[PDB]
Amino acid sequence: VNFPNIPAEGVQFRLRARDTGYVIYSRTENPPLVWQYNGPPYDDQLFTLIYGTGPRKNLYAIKSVPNGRVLFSRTSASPYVGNIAGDGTYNDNWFQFIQDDNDPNSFRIYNLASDTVLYSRTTADPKFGNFTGAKYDDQLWHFELV
């Protein structure tokens, strides 16, 4: 079931992992351009959503406030999770926010094109990335309204 509290189009937020408490950033300098961070608020941690319509109904593009690039999640080449300019030109720029089966307050950031979810962990490298498989708690996220 879709997460029932998805921010309105244009509303700004951070994406913070439930368990690690790390946030996603999306920048233009110093690859990897998309990763996780444990520290103070910076603008490259700020996103809004582009609402999908038509074939993209119930999907969203995740767009950087400062640089305007949207996130992508793919399995075909490195980097697997990255950014690209536009408003969701490519199918792997589109995400579904799927409510957790157990914790109604969190969701997975799911990619239809690549059948992956994003994760954040403190354990094995790579500690941030995408994943196709069983549901684990390190795949759970919050919208943190700013």
Q: For residues 21 and 39, give the distance between their C-alpha atoms in angstroms, rounded to a whole number.
A: 10
Residue nearer to a copy of itself on the CB measure, 8 or 134: 134
Strand partners, 71: 83
Return the beta strands (E) in 7-100 as ranges. 13-17, 23-26, 34-37, 47-51, 60-64, 70-73, 81-84, 95-99
**Ramachandran angles phi, psi of 8, nearest 5°:** -60, 155
Work out how close the CB of 58 gets to a copy of itself at its nearest, in angstroms, rounded to a whole number. 6
Minimum distance of a copy of itself from residue 21's CB (angstroms): 26
Q: Which is nearer to a copy of itself, 56 or 127 (CB)?
A: 56
In the complex, least distance from residue 65 CB atom to a copy of itself, rounded to whole angstroms: 25
CB closer to a copy of itself out of 64 and 114: 114
Q: Which residues bind a copy of itself (CB under 8 A)?
A: 1-2, 54-59, 91, 94, 96, 101, 112-113, 115, 132-135
Neighbours of 53 (CB within 10 A): 9
SS3 of residue 90 by DSSP: coil
- Cβ nearer to a copy of itself, comparing 4 with 40: 4
Least Å distance, CB 56 to a copy of itself, is 6
Give me the residues paired with residue 95 across strands. Answer: 60, 111
